[PDB]
Design an enzyme around this catalytic site. Structure first.
Site, PDB file in Angstrom:
ATOM      1  N   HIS A   1      31.974  35.906 -38.913  1.00 27.26           N
ATOM      2  CA  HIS A   1      30.616  35.332 -39.123  1.00 27.26           C
ATOM      3  C   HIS A   1      29.982  35.034 -37.752  1.00 27.26           C
ATOM      4  CE1 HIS A   1      27.415  33.052 -41.021  1.00 27.26           C
ATOM      5  NE2 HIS A   1      27.768  31.941 -40.401  1.00 27.26           N
TER       6      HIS A   1
ATOM      7  N   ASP B   1      23.399  33.853 -46.212  1.00 26.05           N
ATOM      8  CA  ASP B   1      22.960  32.649 -45.448  1.00 26.05           C
ATOM      9  C   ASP B   1      21.503  32.359 -45.857  1.00 26.05           C
ATOM     10  OD1 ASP B   1      22.697  30.605 -43.374  1.00 26.05           O
ATOM     11  OD2 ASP B   1      24.091  31.765 -42.084  1.00 26.05           O
TER      12      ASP B   1
ATOM     13  N   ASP C   1      26.895  23.927 -46.498  1.00 25.82           N
ATOM     14  CA  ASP C   1      26.794  23.792 -45.045  1.00 25.82           C
ATOM     15  C   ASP C   1      26.162  22.400 -44.745  1.00 25.82           C
ATOM     16  OD1 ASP C   1      26.760  24.531 -42.328  1.00 25.82           O
ATOM     17  OD2 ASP C   1      24.796  25.485 -42.556  1.00 25.82           O
TER      18      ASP C   1
ATOM     19  N   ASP D   1      30.252  26.033 -35.470  1.00 22.89           N
ATOM     20  CA  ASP D   1      29.499  26.955 -34.669  1.00 22.89           C
ATOM     21  C   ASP D   1      30.162  27.240 -33.315  1.00 22.89           C
ATOM     22  OD1 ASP D   1      27.883  27.028 -36.917  1.00 22.89           O
ATOM     23  OD2 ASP D   1      26.183  25.975 -36.002  1.00 22.89           O
TER      24      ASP D   1
ATOM     25  N   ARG E   1      31.843  22.317 -44.427  1.00 22.80           N
ATOM     26  CA  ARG E   1      31.970  22.030 -42.981  1.00 22.80           C
ATOM     27  C   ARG E   1      32.535  20.655 -42.678  1.00 22.80           C
ATOM     28  NH1 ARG E   1      26.865  23.397 -39.130  1.00 22.80           N
ATOM     29  NH2 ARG E   1      26.514  21.137 -39.298  1.00 22.80           N
TER      30      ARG E   1
ATOM     31  N   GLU F   1      24.566  16.542 -41.313  1.00 26.89           N
ATOM     32  CA  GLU F   1      24.255  16.915 -39.928  1.00 26.89           C
ATOM     33  C   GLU F   1      23.286  15.919 -39.253  1.00 26.89           C
ATOM     34  OE1 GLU F   1      21.883  20.594 -38.341  1.00 26.89           O
ATOM     35  OE2 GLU F   1      24.011  21.041 -37.968  1.00 26.89           O
TER      36      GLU F   1
ATOM     37  N   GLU G   1      27.992  16.879 -42.856  1.00 28.70           N
ATOM     38  CA  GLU G   1      28.485  15.815 -41.962  1.00 28.70           C
ATOM     39  C   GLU G   1      27.996  14.403 -42.430  1.00 28.70           C
ATOM     40  OE1 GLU G   1      27.324  18.793 -40.632  1.00 28.70           O
ATOM     41  OE2 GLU G   1      29.455  19.384 -40.533  1.00 28.70           O
TER      42      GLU G   1
HETATM   43  O1  LIG Z   1      22.814  28.454 -41.876  1.00 27.18           O
HETATM   44  C1  LIG Z   1      22.756  28.843 -40.516  1.00 27.18           C
HETATM   45  C2  LIG Z   1      24.067  28.552 -39.734  1.00 27.18           C
HETATM   46  C3  LIG Z   1      25.413  28.912 -40.427  1.00 27.18           C
HETATM   47  O2  LIG Z   1      25.485  30.329 -40.354  1.00 27.18           O
HETATM   48  C4  LIG Z   1      26.645  28.332 -39.726  1.00 27.18           C
HETATM   49  O3  LIG Z   1      27.888  28.823 -40.286  1.00 27.18           O
HETATM   50  C5  LIG Z   1      26.575  26.789 -39.843  1.00 27.18           C
HETATM   51  O4  LIG Z   1      27.736  26.135 -39.336  1.00 27.18           O
HETATM   52  C6  LIG Z   1      25.320  26.316 -39.108  1.00 27.18           C
HETATM   53  N1  LIG Z   1      24.148  25.976 -39.980  1.00 27.18           N
HETATM   54  C7  LIG Z   1      24.036  27.143 -39.097  1.00 27.18           C
END
Ligand SMILES: OC[C@@H]1[C@@H](O)[C@H](O)[C@@H](O)[C@@H]2N[C@H]12
Ligand SMILES: O=C([O-])C(=O)[O-]
Length: 780
Positions: free
Chosen positions: A503, A262, A375, A443, A426, A380, A378
């Site tokens: 995760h 990450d 990541d 999340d 995502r 976001e 969207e």
């Molecule tokens: O990168 C940090 C974190 C990631 O671990 C998650 O899976 C993502 O959906 C969200 N962006 C947040």
């Protein structure tokens, strides 16, 4: 007031002229039609169609009040006055326009009474979304649980109980209203973008989905390693920590294919570094060695990337200089606040943004990176005056991740044509599966509610193209201390859904190797089981590549004439043969499983159940979740390995669930090198088939192999066939005409070729399965 004025055919497409403008109808296949309103005007291209230009030969006929344009299963019937198109499979009405197209973009259709409507992508509203209205705007929903009208990955599409799929082929901020505002009206809306829809029909749900993926795109076979065990948290802070985690899998004897890094791989804080897209060397001092050291243990490295380059990042000045970022209307780089800080967004719709970003993926991939996590697509945060090469943010929003995937897919195929890309993202659009997209449900909170929604989410995404939809196993968001029972249940369910990737935020461990002794004693054999079952899972994956058939299938597939089953989101099929019912509350002591009519076995205990309709009640325990096997199943296994890099099928073990209620059964096992993107196209595979014929006095198995094989393919596999619920009256076996006695004692304690275990009602056959056909015949 809309009415027909004139039509013509040009290049197999029907162009109609009304008082309001032009309408183009092109059949994209025999059961799929693209209807483009405002066809005269310049607009964004299709995103949903794999082959946007195609138009197959259709039949046109005219009458006084109607036109009729027919593809061979799907017919469009065009009423001239007032103007209204409706859609027929045979002469069954699928879907009729009400007022149809208007102004902003607006499409209105009638819903039939009793019609059930799945769709919308990720929502937690109930399987049938009729009676709901919600936006078409990809958006985060941090910490969701048991409800959501709007989350990471919407789809502008629906599937109806009348067995059509309807796609709103439009990328813009919009909305869907599924008979909410008006009870018999389906309304689709957008601020801007393409004014087109696509109707796909089918004679069954499987073939609807085959027809849908035919025109929208088939997922190419992911690398077999994507079916393995991932180590992932948010996040490993250092190379030392990452190496210590790969080590923990080794010292704890859990299988591990891939470790996921990450955002700390590019900086020491959550904020302010994003867009560095390079190693934080104070904490990852020797990353090429790290990745090479992991590859020696058969472990892949996946890195997170994001669309945003922050102004605080080392790549800001350079991205601006290369014109890689989206612009404001003034022409400057657009910068805005994100959680992560102040920055811009890489314009994947431009040549400049695409080249700059691609060059970065290339360089890291050269260094050792095997796969990619994208990541926040969207996007976001996506302010409305942001300008991309082809349109403003609100016009392109829901297609950004889709194009990001396309860009990355093409890039990885260009750099490594002999490898299958791994792209986890995502947010996408209809058809993003044709670029390998593997989505996850974001999340999710660390609650039972978060777990209880995962099946609904998965099935909704699976039905409309996304086989590898999965969740953050164990849950991701917040919590202060591990909920041990929820964690175990979530990692159990994990085994029987597409991607095995626990995760979570790193104040509580997500990886099973960091759990207490009881939790590991429960989960270790299950994670091994996931590896022993690779032939079952990889064969469902193959079928998904071939036909769109999702890995998870809803209960309602079991009976297409019982629309009430559509509401079930608690029991699902994992492949053809397993009916899985996850436990989604604490302390549950038993479950009632709405098993279809027929014969079923307890996967864990071998108990046989027959049912004529009534549900089965099974007790629960902490070591498993309820799984039933369908009579007539062939469950294939290989021995457990640490990593799919060590995968062999030299030894097979196959379990056949016999019952006289199933007089004819089949299975298959798809084997290839686990890595070649062209294996299927070029027939570089070994396709094992098994057919059982079960009559009153005999049980006959026919085994065969097709395909041209592949390098390293075993010529001869040692095969143990275990027949569950085998009759105790089988006297002899012949293998290819050669008679062998069946032993009735000491089956577990002699190198027996055929042995009946009377206490377990299992008949075990051990043999060599070579390239030629094999026939095993048991006779009373
Ligand atoms: O990168 C940090 C974190 C990631 O671990 C998650 O899976 C993502 O959906 C969200 N962006 C947040
Ligand atoms: O199933 C049979 O054929 C039996 O039970 O003996």
């Amino acid at each position: 007031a809309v009415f027909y004025k004139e039509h013509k055919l040009r290049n197999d497409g029907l162009v109609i002229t009304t008082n309001q403008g032009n309408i183009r109808l092109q059949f994209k296949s025999e059961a799929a039609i693209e209807v483009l309103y405002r066809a005269d005007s310049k607009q964004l291209p299709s995103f949903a169609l794999a082959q946007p230009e195609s138009a197959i030969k259709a039949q046109l006929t005219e009458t006084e009040n109607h036109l009729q344009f027919s593809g061979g299963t799907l017919t469009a019937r065009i009423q001239k006055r007032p103007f209204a198109i409706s859609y027929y499979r045979d002469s069954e009405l699928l879907l009729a326009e009400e007022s149809g197209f208007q102004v902003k973009i607006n499409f209105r259709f009638y819903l039939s009474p009793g019609e059930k409507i799945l769709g919308g992508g990720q929502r937690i509203l109930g399987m049938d979304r009729r009676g709901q209205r919600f936006p078409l705007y990809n958006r985060a929903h941090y910490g969701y649980s048991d409800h959501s009208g709007q989350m990471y990955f919407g789809l502008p599409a629906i599937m109806s109980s009348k067995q059509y799929i309807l796609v709103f082929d439009n990328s813009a901020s919009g909305a869907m209203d599924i008979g909410k505002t008006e009870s018999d009206i389906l309304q689709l809306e957008a601020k801007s973008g393409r004014s087109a829809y696509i109707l796909v029909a089918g004679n069954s749900y499987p073939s609807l989905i085959e027809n849908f993926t035919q025109v929208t795109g088939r997922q190419p076979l992911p690398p077999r390693w994507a079916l393995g065990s991932f180590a992932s948290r948010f996040g490993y802070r250092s190379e030392a920590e990452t190496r210590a985690t790969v080590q923990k899998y080794k010292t704890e004897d859990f299988p591990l294919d891939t470790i996921v890094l990450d955002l700390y791989w590019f900086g020491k804080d959550i904020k302010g570094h994003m867009g560095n897209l390079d190693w934080d060397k104070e904490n990852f001092p020797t990353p090429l060695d790290m990745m090479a050291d992991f590859k020696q243990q058969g472990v892949k490295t996946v890195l997170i990337t994001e669309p945003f380059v922050l102004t605080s990042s080392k790549r800001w000045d350079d991205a601006v200089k290369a014109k890689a970022l989206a612009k404001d209307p003034q022409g400057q780089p657009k910068a805005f606040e994100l959680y992560f800080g102040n920055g811009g967004i890489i314009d994947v719709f431009s040549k400049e943004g695409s080249r700059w970003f691609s060059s970065i993926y290339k360089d890291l991939s050269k260094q050792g990176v095997a796969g990619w996590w994208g990541d926040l697509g969207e996007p976001e945060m996506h302010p409305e005056d942001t300008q991309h090469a082809i349109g403003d943010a609100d016009t392109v929003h829901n297609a950004y991740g889709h194009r990001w995937a396309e860009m990355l897919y093409q890039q990885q195929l260009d750099q490594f044509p002999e490898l299958r890309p791994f792209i986890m993202m995502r947010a996408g659009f209809v058809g993003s599966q044709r670029y390998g997209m593997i989505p996850w449900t974001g999340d999710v909170s660390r609650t039972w509610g978060g777990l209880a929604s995962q099946v609904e989410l998965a099935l909704q995404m699976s039905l409309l193209g996304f086989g590898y939809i999965h969740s953050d196993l164990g849950g991701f968001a917040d919590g202060e201390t591990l909920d041990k029972e929820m964690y175990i249940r979530w990692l159990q369910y994990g085994v029987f859904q597409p991607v095995y990737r626990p995760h979570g935020q790193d104040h509580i461990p997500s990886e099973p190797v960091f759990q207490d002794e009881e939790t590991k004693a429960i989960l270790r054999p299950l994670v091994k089981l996931r590896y022993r079952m690779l032939p079952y899972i990889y064969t469902a994956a193959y079928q998904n590549t071939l036909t769109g058939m999702p890995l998870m299938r809803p209960l309602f597939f079991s009976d297409e004439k019982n629309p009430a089953l559509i509401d079930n989101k608690t029991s699902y099929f994992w492949g053809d043969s397993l009916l899985v019912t996850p436990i989604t509350q604490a302390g549950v002591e038993s479950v009632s499983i709405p098993a279809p009519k027929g014969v079923w076995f307890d996967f864990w205990k071998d108990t046989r159940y027959q049912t004529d309709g009534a549900p089965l009640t099974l007790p629960t325990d902490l070591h498993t979740i309820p799984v039933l096997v369908k009579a007539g199943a062939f469950m294939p296994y290989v021995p457990a390995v640490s990593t799919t890099e060590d995968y062999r099928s030299d030894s097979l073990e196959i379990h056949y669930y016999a019952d006289a209620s199933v007089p004819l059964a089949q299975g298959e096992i798809f084997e290839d090198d686990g890595k070649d993107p062209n294996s299927i196209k070029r027939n570089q595979f070994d396709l094992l088939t098994l057919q059982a014929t079960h009559t009153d006095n005999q049980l006959h198995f026919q085994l065969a192999r097709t395909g041209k094989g592949y390098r390293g393919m075993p010529e001869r596999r040692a095969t143990t066939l275990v027949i569950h619920n085998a009759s105790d009256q089988y006297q002899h076996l012949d293998i290819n005409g050669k008679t062998i006695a069946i032993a009735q004692a000491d089956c577990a304690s002699t190198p027996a070729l055929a042995c009946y275990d009377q206490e377990r009602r299992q008949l075990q056959l051990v043999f060599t399965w070579g390239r030629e056909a094999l026939n095993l015949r048991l006779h009373k």
